[PDB]
Design a protein around this ligand. Structure first.
Ligand SMILES: CCOc1nc(N2C[C@H]3C(=O)N(C)C(=N)N[C@@]3(c3ccc(C#N)s3)C2)nc(C)c1F
Length: 387
C-alpha cells in the first residue's frame, strides 16, 4: 500500500552505494549502512579508520553481547575482519521495531571503506547460505521477521540522479526508498511482474533472452546465467558473463556506430563527455532482459535505456559518463544501474522478485524504461546453469 515513513529513506548513488540510517546499541548509536542484496552479514566499522567519521563503540552499549568469535571476510576487490556479537538494532525511517541482531564489529579492513561514501557498515539482505563464517549466523532480515510481525518481504527503489552530485548535494539528495515489509504503490508505474527466486542464497534469477534495440543476442540462454544471475544492490554495474559481454558490446557498438568511442570507454575505465545538454541518448540502444515468469512457459521483459547504463561522472560544463556494463567471471549481476530503472520487490515469502518501472528512473521525452509481458518461452529451466 502506502509506507510514508519509509519512502525516501535512502541516500547515495550507484558508484558508492545506497545507504539507510540505522541505530545500534543502548543508548542508540546512529550509523549509515549500505543496503546490499549481494551479501548476508550485518557488519559495521567498530574501530577508527581514516575514512570513517564514526563507528560502533561496543563498550558504550549496555545491550552489547560478545559472541567470542571472529569473522574473516576476504572477497575479490576488498577484505574485512571483525568480532561477532549481538545488540539491539533499529531503522529510524523503517518499521517501528527494535530487534536483537548479529553484528560483525569490523576491527581491520582493506579497500572496504570508501573515502566520501558516507556509510560506516553494510546490511547484507541475502540468505543465510552465504553468511560468514557460516550459515548458522542468522542474517538481519531473518532476525527481524522472526522477532516481529514484519512481513517477509522488502522492496527497493534506487534513484539515480541522471547527473553528478557533489559532496553537499549527495548528502542533501534523496537516493531512494527501502520499504521493509511491504510494497509502496507510489514508487512505480504500470504493473509488477515477478520472476522466481531460483534458489535462496544470493537473489538468483534466470534470464531467458537478451535483446539490444529489439535485436536478439541469439546466444544459448545458459550463457546468460553462467554460472548464476543475481540481483545485487551492492554492485554498481550491469555485469555480464565474458562471452555475453563480448556479444553485447559488439551489438551496442554497432547500434551506436554513428559515433566512435575509444576502447577505454567500452572497458568502463574512461569517461566520454559531450557539450552541456547534448548527450546523444538516441544513438544508444535500449537493452531488454527477459526473465522467467511465474506461469509455466511464460516470460516477461525489463528494458533499460542508456540513461541507466551510462553512469554520470564529473569531468567543465560538459555532461560526462562512464559505460556501466562490464565483464564478469562469476555470472550476471543486475547491479545498481539495472535497479535504478525499476522498483524491485524482494518477495521472500513467495520466493519471487518483482519488477516495475520506477517512478524515479531517468529518461527522455522519446523513450522510457519498461516492464512488459507476457511472452511465450519454452524450456526455460534449461537456461539455468548446473555444476
Ligand atoms: C564471496 C564473498 O562473500 C561475501 N561478500 C561480501 N561482499 C562482497 C562485496 C562485493 O563485492 N559485492 C559486489 C557486494 N554486493 N557486496 C560486498 C561489498 C563491499 C563494498 C560494497 C560497496 N559499495 S558492496 C560485500 N560480504 C560478505 C560478508 C561475504 F561473505
Amino acid at each position: 500500500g502506502s509506507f510514508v515513513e519509509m519512502v525516501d529513506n535512502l541516500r547515495g548513488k550507484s558508484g558508492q552505494g545506497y545507504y539507510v540510517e540505522m541505530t545500534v546499541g543502548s543508548p542508540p548509536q546512529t550509523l549509515n549502512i549500505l543496503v546490499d542484496t549481494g551479501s548476508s552479514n550485518f557488519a559495521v566499522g567498530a574501530a577508527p579508520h581514516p575514512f570513517l567519521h564514526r563507528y560502533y563503540q561496543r563498550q558504550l552499549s549496555s545491550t552489547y553481547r560478545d559472541l567470542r568469535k571472529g569473522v574473516y571476510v576476504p572477497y575479490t576487490q576488498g577484505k574485512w575482519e571483525g568480532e561477532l556479537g549481538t545488540d539491539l538494532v533499529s531503522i529510524p525511517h523503517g518499521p517501528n521495531v527494535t530487534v536483537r541482531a548479529n553484528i560483525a564489529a569490523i576491527t581491520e579492513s582493506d579497500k572496504f571503506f570508501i573515502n566520501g561514501s558516507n556509510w560506516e557498515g553494510i546490511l547484507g539482505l541475502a540468505y543465510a547460505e552465504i553468511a560468514r563464517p557460516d550459515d548458522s549466523l542468522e542474517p538481519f532480515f531473518d532476525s527481524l521477521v522472526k522477532q516481529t510481525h514484519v512481513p517477509n518481504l522488502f522492496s527497493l527503489q534506487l534513484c539515480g540522479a541522471g547527473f553528478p552530485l557533489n559532496q553537499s548535494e549527495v548528502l542533501a539528495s534523496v537516493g531512494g526508498s527501502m520499504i521493509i515489509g511491504g510494497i509502496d504503490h507510489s514508487l512505480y508505474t504500470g504493473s509488477l511482474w515477478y520472476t522466481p527466486i531460483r534458489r535462496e542464497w544470493y537473489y538468483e534469477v534466470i534470464i531467458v533472452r537478451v535483446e539490444i534495440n529489439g535485436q536478439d543476442l541469439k546466444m544459448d540462454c545458459k550463457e546468460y546465467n553462467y554460472d548464476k544471475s543475481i540481483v545485487d544492490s551492492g554492485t554498481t554495474n550491469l555485469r555480464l558473463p565474458k562471452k555475453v559481454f563480448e556479444a553485447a558490446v559488439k551489438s551496442i557498438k554497432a547500434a551506436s556506430s554513428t559515433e566512435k568511442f575509444p576502447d577505454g570507454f567500452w572497458l568502463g575505465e574512461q569517461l566520454v563527455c559531450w557539450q552541456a545538454g547534448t548527450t546523444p541518448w538516441n544513438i544508444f540502444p535500449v537493452i531488454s532482459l527477459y526473465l522467467m515468469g511465474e506461469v509455466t512457459n511464460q516470460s516477461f521483459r525489463i528494458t533499460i535505456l542508456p540513461q541507466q547504463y551510462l553512469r554520470p561522472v564529473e569531468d567543465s560544463q560538459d555532461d560526462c559518463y562512464k559505460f556501466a556494463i562490464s565483464q564478469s567471471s562469476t555470472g550476471t549481476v543486475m547491479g545498481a544501474v539495472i535497479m535504478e530503472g525499476f522498483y524491485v520487490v524482494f518477495d521472500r515469502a513467495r520466493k519471487r522478485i518483482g519488477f516495475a518501472v520506477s517512478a524515479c528512473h531517468v529518461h527522455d521525452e522519446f523513450r522510457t524504461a519498461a516492464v512488459e509481458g507476457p511472452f511465450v518461452t519454452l524450456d526455460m529451466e534449461d537456461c539455468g546453469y548446473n555444476i
